[PDB]
């Protein structure tokens, strides 16, 4: 597998780190279904 570490940019006062985890985890299966990609886990930090 591959461990990828990058920087994700979001508008300020729009989306919180908590919301990002919600959609990504919820989309892990569907985003995966659309692109046929497999994800093990996601982690987002504001620091």
């Amino acid at each position: 597998s591959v461990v990828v570490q990058l920087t994700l940019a979001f508008r300020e006062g729009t989306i919180n780190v908590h919301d990002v985890e919600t959609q990504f985890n919820q989309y892990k299966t569907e985003a995966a279904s659309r692109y046929n990609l497999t994800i093990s886990d996601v982690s987002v930090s504001d620091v």
Partner: protein, 57 residues
């Protein structure tokens, strides 16, 4: 604002090409992920992908 996102994929294996952005596989992979991400964050808060780095898992 910027956030640090990290995750592991099983669909793909680590490649030397991914150990260097000098390859199209790496560049496209980013794009594919960037494309996929745009679907997840369609909320609009999304702006773009920057400072990407890959590593064996």
């Amino acid at each position: 604002s910027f956030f640090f996102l990290s995750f592991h994929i099983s669909n793909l294996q680590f490649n030397s090409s991914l150990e260097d952005p000098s390859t199209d596989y790496y560049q496209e992979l980013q794009r594919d992920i960037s494309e996929m991400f745009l679907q997840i964050y369609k909320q609009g808060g999304f702006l773009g992908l920057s400072n990407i780095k890959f590593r064996p898992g």
